[PDB]
Design a binder for this molecule. Structure first.
Ligand SMILES: Nc1ncnc2c1ncn2C1O[C@@H](CSCCC(N)C(=O)O)[C@@H](O)C1O
Length: 371
Protein backbone atom coordinates (compact mmCIF):
# COMPACT_ATOMS: atom_id res chain seq x y z
CA UNK A 1 0.00 0.00 0.00
CA UNK A 2 2.30 2.78 1.26
CA UNK A 3 6.10 3.23 1.37
CA UNK A 4 7.75 5.82 3.65
CA UNK A 5 10.35 7.92 1.81
CA UNK A 6 12.32 11.04 2.68
CA UNK A 7 12.86 14.29 0.76
CA UNK A 8 14.74 17.16 2.35
CA UNK A 9 13.44 17.54 5.90
CA UNK A 10 10.24 15.82 4.82
CA UNK A 11 9.13 12.29 5.63
CA UNK A 12 6.14 11.12 3.62
CA UNK A 13 4.17 8.07 2.59
CA UNK A 14 3.79 7.44 -1.12
CA UNK A 15 1.79 4.65 -2.77
CA UNK A 16 3.96 1.83 -4.05
CA UNK A 17 3.18 1.07 -7.67
CA UNK A 18 4.69 -0.14 -10.94
CA UNK A 19 5.43 3.38 -12.19
CA UNK A 20 4.82 6.91 -10.91
CA UNK A 21 1.84 7.14 -13.29
CA UNK A 22 0.30 4.00 -11.81
CA UNK A 23 0.06 4.95 -8.15
CA UNK A 24 -3.31 6.23 -6.82
CA UNK A 25 -1.51 9.40 -5.73
CA UNK A 26 1.17 10.90 -7.97
CA UNK A 27 4.75 11.41 -6.82
CA UNK A 28 7.74 11.86 -9.11
CA UNK A 29 11.06 11.56 -7.29
CA UNK A 30 12.87 13.19 -10.21
CA UNK A 31 11.00 16.37 -9.29
CA UNK A 32 12.94 16.54 -6.03
CA UNK A 33 15.39 18.93 -7.71
CA UNK A 34 12.50 21.16 -8.81
CA UNK A 35 11.30 21.37 -5.20
CA UNK A 36 14.80 22.05 -3.88
CA UNK A 37 15.11 25.19 -6.01
CA UNK A 38 11.72 26.63 -5.04
CA UNK A 39 12.70 25.99 -1.40
CA UNK A 40 16.04 27.78 -1.85
CA UNK A 41 14.22 30.67 -3.51
CA UNK A 42 11.50 30.89 -0.87
CA UNK A 43 14.29 31.10 1.70
CA UNK A 44 15.19 34.40 0.03
CA UNK A 45 11.92 36.00 -1.04
CA UNK A 46 10.48 34.94 2.32
CA UNK A 47 6.80 34.80 1.31
CA UNK A 48 4.47 34.63 4.33
CA UNK A 49 1.32 33.00 2.86
CA UNK A 50 2.01 30.35 0.19
CA UNK A 51 -0.04 27.87 -1.85
CA UNK A 52 0.77 24.45 -3.31
CA UNK A 53 -2.08 24.55 -5.88
CA UNK A 54 -1.91 20.91 -6.97
CA UNK A 55 -0.39 19.15 -3.96
CA UNK A 56 -0.81 15.39 -4.67
CA UNK A 57 1.08 13.76 -1.74
CA UNK A 58 1.49 17.17 -0.15
CA UNK A 59 5.27 16.90 -0.36
CA UNK A 60 5.83 20.37 -1.87
CA UNK A 61 3.70 22.24 0.65
CA UNK A 62 5.06 20.08 3.45
CA UNK A 63 8.62 21.05 2.53
CA UNK A 64 7.44 24.66 2.27
CA UNK A 65 6.38 24.53 5.92
CA UNK A 66 9.45 22.64 7.18
CA UNK A 67 12.17 24.30 5.09
CA UNK A 68 11.04 27.89 4.52
CA UNK A 69 9.91 31.05 6.39
CA UNK A 70 6.37 30.44 5.12
CA UNK A 71 3.97 30.90 8.04
CA UNK A 72 0.68 29.84 6.45
CA UNK A 73 0.99 26.93 4.01
CA UNK A 74 -1.97 25.84 1.91
CA UNK A 75 -2.13 22.38 0.32
CA UNK A 76 -4.78 21.52 -2.23
CA UNK A 77 -5.75 18.70 -4.56
CA UNK A 78 -8.94 17.73 -6.39
CA UNK A 79 -8.42 14.03 -5.68
CA UNK A 80 -9.96 12.38 -2.62
CA UNK A 81 -7.12 9.87 -2.20
CA UNK A 82 -4.60 12.70 -2.52
CA UNK A 83 -6.43 14.75 0.09
CA UNK A 84 -6.33 11.79 2.47
CA UNK A 85 -2.64 11.09 1.86
CA UNK A 86 -1.95 14.83 2.29
CA UNK A 87 -3.63 14.95 5.71
CA UNK A 88 -1.71 11.87 6.75
CA UNK A 89 1.68 13.16 5.56
CA UNK A 90 1.06 16.50 7.24
CA UNK A 91 0.41 14.83 10.60
CA UNK A 92 3.52 12.80 9.83
CA UNK A 93 5.77 15.89 9.92
CA UNK A 94 3.81 18.06 12.31
CA UNK A 95 2.48 17.60 15.82
CA UNK A 96 -0.84 18.52 17.37
CA UNK A 97 -4.23 17.41 16.07
CA UNK A 98 -5.75 18.22 12.70
CA UNK A 99 -9.12 19.98 13.03
CA UNK A 100 -10.62 18.39 9.94
CA UNK A 101 -13.97 19.07 8.30
CA UNK A 102 -15.85 18.39 5.06
CA UNK A 103 -13.05 18.26 2.49
CA UNK A 104 -11.06 20.87 4.40
CA UNK A 105 -8.61 20.54 7.32
CA UNK A 106 -6.61 23.00 9.36
CA UNK A 107 -3.63 22.84 11.74
CA UNK A 108 -2.75 25.93 13.80
CA UNK A 109 0.71 25.26 15.24
CA UNK A 110 4.04 27.05 14.81
CA UNK A 111 3.09 27.21 11.13
CA UNK A 112 -0.53 27.19 9.98
CA UNK A 113 -1.40 24.40 7.59
CA UNK A 114 -4.52 24.50 5.48
CA UNK A 115 -5.27 21.23 3.68
CA UNK A 116 -8.01 21.39 1.01
CA UNK A 117 -9.98 18.84 -1.02
CA UNK A 118 -10.96 21.13 -3.85
CA UNK A 119 -10.51 22.18 -7.47
CA UNK A 120 -7.59 24.63 -7.79
CA UNK A 121 -9.59 27.07 -9.91
CA UNK A 122 -12.30 26.98 -7.26
CA UNK A 123 -9.93 27.50 -4.31
CA UNK A 124 -7.88 30.25 -5.92
CA UNK A 125 -11.05 31.97 -7.08
CA UNK A 126 -12.36 32.00 -3.51
CA UNK A 127 -8.99 33.34 -2.36
CA UNK A 128 -8.81 36.58 -4.41
CA UNK A 129 -5.55 38.55 -3.96
CA UNK A 130 -4.64 36.33 -1.02
CA UNK A 131 -1.29 34.62 -1.57
CA UNK A 132 2.24 35.99 -1.46
CA UNK A 133 3.32 32.94 -3.45
CA UNK A 134 1.53 30.34 -5.55
CA UNK A 135 3.25 27.30 -7.04
CA UNK A 136 1.61 25.69 -10.07
CA UNK A 137 2.88 22.20 -10.78
CA UNK A 138 0.33 20.52 -13.11
CA UNK A 139 0.56 17.54 -15.42
CA UNK A 140 2.01 19.31 -18.43
CA UNK A 141 0.38 22.66 -19.20
CA UNK A 142 -0.56 25.27 -16.51
CA UNK A 143 -2.84 27.29 -18.83
CA UNK A 144 -6.04 25.93 -17.25
CA UNK A 145 -5.05 27.60 -13.94
CA UNK A 146 -2.81 30.51 -14.96
CA UNK A 147 -5.54 33.14 -15.20
CA UNK A 148 -7.09 32.32 -11.84
CA UNK A 149 -3.67 32.17 -10.20
CA UNK A 150 -2.89 35.69 -11.46
CA UNK A 151 -5.97 36.80 -9.55
CA UNK A 152 -5.33 34.74 -6.40
CA UNK A 153 -1.80 35.99 -5.85
CA UNK A 154 -1.28 39.42 -4.24
CA UNK A 155 -0.82 42.23 -6.77
CA UNK A 156 2.80 42.08 -5.59
CA UNK A 157 2.82 38.32 -5.12
CA UNK A 158 5.22 35.78 -6.57
CA UNK A 159 4.10 33.19 -9.10
CA UNK A 160 5.85 29.89 -9.64
CA UNK A 161 4.85 27.94 -12.73
CA UNK A 162 6.17 24.63 -14.04
CA UNK A 163 5.37 23.29 -17.51
CA UNK A 164 6.04 19.67 -18.42
CA UNK A 165 4.51 20.51 -21.80
CA UNK A 166 7.65 19.83 -23.85
CA UNK A 167 5.87 18.68 -27.04
CA UNK A 168 4.06 21.98 -27.67
CA UNK A 169 6.70 24.25 -26.08
CA UNK A 170 9.59 22.76 -28.08
CA UNK A 171 7.91 22.77 -31.47
CA UNK A 172 6.97 19.10 -31.86
CA UNK A 173 3.27 20.02 -31.75
CA UNK A 174 3.03 23.58 -33.20
CA UNK A 175 -0.79 23.64 -33.36
CA UNK A 176 -1.02 22.50 -29.76
CA UNK A 177 1.40 25.27 -28.79
CA UNK A 178 -0.75 27.83 -30.59
CA UNK A 179 -3.89 26.75 -28.69
CA UNK A 180 -2.46 26.70 -25.19
CA UNK A 181 0.24 29.34 -25.31
CA UNK A 182 -0.85 31.54 -28.22
CA UNK A 183 2.66 31.46 -29.68
CA UNK A 184 4.43 29.97 -32.70
CA UNK A 185 7.16 27.62 -31.31
CA UNK A 186 10.66 27.06 -32.66
CA UNK A 187 12.15 23.58 -32.72
CA UNK A 188 15.78 22.60 -32.90
CA UNK A 189 18.89 23.31 -30.87
CA UNK A 190 17.26 26.38 -29.28
CA UNK A 191 13.80 25.03 -28.35
CA UNK A 192 14.81 24.82 -24.68
CA UNK A 193 15.28 28.56 -24.24
CA UNK A 194 12.58 29.53 -26.71
CA UNK A 195 10.18 27.24 -24.88
CA UNK A 196 11.07 28.89 -21.56
CA UNK A 197 10.71 32.36 -23.07
CA UNK A 198 7.33 31.43 -24.56
CA UNK A 199 6.22 30.41 -21.07
CA UNK A 200 7.30 33.68 -19.46
CA UNK A 201 5.75 35.68 -22.29
CA UNK A 202 2.35 34.04 -21.90
CA UNK A 203 2.33 34.85 -18.18
CA UNK A 204 3.36 38.41 -19.04
CA UNK A 205 0.48 38.62 -21.50
CA UNK A 206 -2.16 37.22 -19.16
CA UNK A 207 -1.07 39.48 -16.29
CA UNK A 208 -1.37 42.74 -18.22
CA UNK A 209 -5.18 43.11 -18.14
CA UNK A 210 -5.00 43.31 -14.34
CA UNK A 211 -2.66 46.25 -14.83
CA UNK A 212 0.18 44.06 -13.61
CA UNK A 213 3.61 43.49 -15.09
CA UNK A 214 6.30 41.02 -14.16
CA UNK A 215 9.96 40.67 -13.22
CA UNK A 216 11.48 37.30 -13.96
CA UNK A 217 13.13 36.18 -10.74
CA UNK A 218 14.35 32.96 -12.30
CA UNK A 219 13.33 30.92 -15.34
CA UNK A 220 15.07 27.81 -16.63
CA UNK A 221 14.73 24.42 -18.33
CA UNK A 222 15.72 21.06 -16.83
CA UNK A 223 14.81 17.38 -17.07
CA UNK A 224 12.18 18.09 -19.72
CA UNK A 225 10.28 20.80 -17.87
CA UNK A 226 10.06 24.59 -17.90
CA UNK A 227 10.29 26.60 -14.68
CA UNK A 228 9.29 30.21 -14.26
CA UNK A 229 9.32 32.30 -11.09
CA UNK A 230 7.97 35.80 -11.55
CA UNK A 231 7.30 38.77 -9.32
CA UNK A 232 4.09 40.69 -10.08
CA UNK A 233 4.28 44.49 -10.41
CA UNK A 234 1.31 46.69 -9.55
CA UNK A 235 0.41 49.32 -12.16
CA UNK A 236 -0.65 49.87 -15.79
CA UNK A 237 2.74 51.50 -16.40
CA UNK A 238 4.46 48.29 -15.20
CA UNK A 239 2.12 46.29 -17.41
CA UNK A 240 2.96 48.36 -20.48
CA UNK A 241 6.70 48.03 -19.83
CA UNK A 242 6.32 44.26 -19.51
CA UNK A 243 4.54 43.83 -22.85
CA UNK A 244 7.36 45.95 -24.33
CA UNK A 245 9.76 43.18 -23.35
CA UNK A 246 7.98 40.83 -25.75
CA UNK A 247 9.41 40.12 -29.18
CA UNK A 248 9.92 37.59 -31.96
CA UNK A 249 12.66 35.33 -33.28
CA UNK A 250 13.86 34.68 -36.83
CA UNK A 251 15.92 31.52 -37.41
CA UNK A 252 17.90 30.27 -40.40
CA UNK A 253 18.05 26.48 -39.97
CA UNK A 254 20.72 26.18 -42.68
CA UNK A 255 23.21 28.31 -40.76
CA UNK A 256 21.95 28.52 -37.19
CA UNK A 257 21.90 32.32 -37.33
CA UNK A 258 19.06 33.95 -35.42
CA UNK A 259 17.61 37.46 -35.15
CA UNK A 260 15.47 39.20 -32.57
CA UNK A 261 12.80 41.85 -32.89
CA UNK A 262 11.26 43.66 -29.94
CA UNK A 263 7.61 44.59 -30.31
CA UNK A 264 4.12 43.30 -29.63
CA UNK A 265 3.92 42.27 -33.30
CA UNK A 266 6.58 41.09 -35.77
CA UNK A 267 7.21 42.99 -39.00
CA UNK A 268 8.79 40.27 -41.14
CA UNK A 269 7.74 36.82 -42.32
CA UNK A 270 8.61 33.55 -40.57
CA UNK A 271 8.52 34.95 -37.05
CA UNK A 272 8.59 32.72 -33.98
CA UNK A 273 6.82 33.87 -30.84
CA UNK A 274 5.78 36.02 -29.19
CA UNK A 275 8.45 35.33 -26.57
CA UNK A 276 9.87 37.10 -23.54
CA UNK A 277 13.02 38.88 -24.71
CA UNK A 278 13.69 40.33 -21.27
CA UNK A 279 15.92 38.96 -18.47
CA UNK A 280 15.53 35.31 -17.53
CA UNK A 281 16.80 35.99 -14.03
CA UNK A 282 17.39 38.51 -11.27
CA UNK A 283 21.16 38.08 -10.80
CA UNK A 284 21.21 39.62 -7.33
CA UNK A 285 18.64 37.06 -6.21
CA UNK A 286 20.10 34.05 -8.03
CA UNK A 287 23.50 34.75 -6.46
CA UNK A 288 22.08 34.58 -2.96
CA UNK A 289 20.33 31.35 -3.94
CA UNK A 290 23.72 29.75 -4.54
CA UNK A 291 24.84 30.95 -1.12
CA UNK A 292 21.60 29.83 0.55
CA UNK A 293 21.56 26.44 -1.21
CA UNK A 294 25.01 25.76 0.24
CA UNK A 295 23.72 26.29 3.78
CA UNK A 296 20.66 24.04 3.33
CA UNK A 297 19.98 20.31 3.38
CA UNK A 298 18.31 19.75 0.01
CA UNK A 299 17.17 16.44 -1.49
CA UNK A 300 19.60 16.77 -4.39
CA UNK A 301 22.16 19.29 -3.14
CA UNK A 302 24.91 18.38 -5.59
CA UNK A 303 22.67 18.80 -8.65
CA UNK A 304 20.93 21.80 -7.08
CA UNK A 305 24.24 23.59 -6.60
CA UNK A 306 25.53 22.52 -10.00
CA UNK A 307 22.41 23.93 -11.68
CA UNK A 308 22.25 27.12 -9.61
CA UNK A 309 25.92 27.93 -10.19
CA UNK A 310 25.58 27.42 -13.93
CA UNK A 311 22.65 29.82 -14.08
CA UNK A 312 24.46 32.22 -11.74
CA UNK A 313 27.47 32.67 -14.05
CA UNK A 314 25.38 32.47 -17.22
CA UNK A 315 25.03 35.53 -19.45
CA UNK A 316 21.47 36.87 -19.51
CA UNK A 317 21.30 37.37 -23.26
CA UNK A 318 18.53 36.01 -25.53
CA UNK A 319 19.38 32.66 -27.17
CA UNK A 320 22.80 31.18 -27.86
CA UNK A 321 24.94 29.12 -30.24
CA UNK A 322 25.07 25.35 -30.12
CA UNK A 323 28.62 24.34 -31.07
CA UNK A 324 27.47 20.82 -31.95
CA UNK A 325 24.67 21.82 -34.32
CA UNK A 326 26.67 24.61 -35.94
CA UNK A 327 29.63 22.26 -36.13
CA UNK A 328 27.55 19.92 -38.29
CA UNK A 329 26.92 22.75 -40.75
CA UNK A 330 36.50 22.64 -31.01
CA UNK A 331 35.92 22.40 -27.25
CA UNK A 332 33.50 24.84 -25.64
CA UNK A 333 36.13 26.01 -23.12
CA UNK A 334 38.49 26.92 -25.95
CA UNK A 335 35.84 28.77 -27.94
CA UNK A 336 34.78 30.72 -24.86
CA UNK A 337 38.39 31.66 -24.10
CA UNK A 338 39.03 32.69 -27.70
CA UNK A 339 35.86 34.80 -27.55
CA UNK A 340 36.85 36.55 -24.35
CA UNK A 341 40.38 37.37 -25.57
CA UNK A 342 38.79 39.31 -28.43
CA UNK A 343 36.82 41.24 -25.87
CA UNK A 344 33.43 39.52 -26.24
CA UNK A 345 31.35 38.17 -23.36
CA UNK A 346 30.86 34.42 -23.44
CA UNK A 347 29.58 31.81 -21.00
CA UNK A 348 28.19 28.29 -20.96
CA UNK A 349 24.41 27.88 -20.69
CA UNK A 350 22.25 25.47 -18.72
CA UNK A 351 20.04 25.19 -21.81
CA UNK A 352 22.60 23.08 -23.67
CA UNK A 353 25.85 21.26 -22.79
CA UNK A 354 27.46 22.50 -26.01
CA UNK A 355 25.68 25.84 -26.03
CA UNK A 356 27.48 29.16 -25.69
CA UNK A 357 25.87 32.53 -24.91
CA UNK A 358 27.79 35.51 -26.23
CA UNK A 359 27.70 39.16 -27.21
CA UNK A 360 29.56 38.29 -30.44
CA UNK A 361 27.62 38.38 -33.74
CA UNK A 362 26.87 35.18 -35.62
CA UNK A 363 29.60 35.91 -38.16
CA UNK A 364 32.32 36.49 -35.55
CA UNK A 365 31.21 33.36 -33.73
CA UNK A 366 31.69 31.28 -36.87
CA UNK A 367 35.04 32.89 -37.67
CA UNK A 368 36.29 32.22 -34.15
CA UNK A 369 35.43 28.52 -34.05
CA UNK A 370 37.16 28.17 -37.42
CA UNK A 371 40.43 29.69 -36.20
N1 LIG B 1 -8.39 21.08 -11.08
C1 LIG B 1 -7.56 20.55 -10.19
N2 LIG B 1 -7.51 21.04 -8.88
C2 LIG B 1 -6.66 20.51 -7.95
N3 LIG B 1 -5.84 19.47 -8.30
C3 LIG B 1 -5.84 18.94 -9.61
C4 LIG B 1 -6.72 19.49 -10.58
N4 LIG B 1 -6.54 18.84 -11.69
C5 LIG B 1 -5.63 17.94 -11.51
N5 LIG B 1 -5.20 17.98 -10.26
C6 LIG B 1 -4.09 16.99 -9.73
O1 LIG B 1 -2.75 17.40 -9.88
C7 LIG B 1 -1.88 16.31 -9.63
C8 LIG B 1 -0.57 16.92 -10.17
S1 LIG B 1 0.76 16.01 -9.67
C9 LIG B 1 1.47 17.15 -8.62
C10 LIG B 1 2.68 17.32 -7.73
C11 LIG B 1 3.62 18.06 -6.72
N6 LIG B 1 2.92 19.23 -6.58
C12 LIG B 1 4.83 17.53 -6.21
O2 LIG B 1 5.82 18.29 -6.02
O3 LIG B 1 4.70 16.24 -6.02
C13 LIG B 1 -2.64 15.27 -8.84
O4 LIG B 1 -2.43 14.91 -7.45
C14 LIG B 1 -4.10 15.64 -9.06
O5 LIG B 1 -5.19 14.95 -8.76
Amino acid sequence: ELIEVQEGKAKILIPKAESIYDSPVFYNPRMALNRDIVVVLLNILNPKIVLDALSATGIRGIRFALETPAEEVWLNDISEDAYELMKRNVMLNFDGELRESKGRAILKGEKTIVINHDDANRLMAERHRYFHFIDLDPFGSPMEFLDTALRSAKRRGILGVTATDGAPLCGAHPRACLRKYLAVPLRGELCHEVGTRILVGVIARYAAKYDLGIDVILAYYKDHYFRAFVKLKDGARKGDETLEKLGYIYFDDKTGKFELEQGFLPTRPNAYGPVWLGPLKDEKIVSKMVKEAESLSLARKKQALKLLKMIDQELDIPLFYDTHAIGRRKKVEEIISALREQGYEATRTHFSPTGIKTSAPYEVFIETIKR
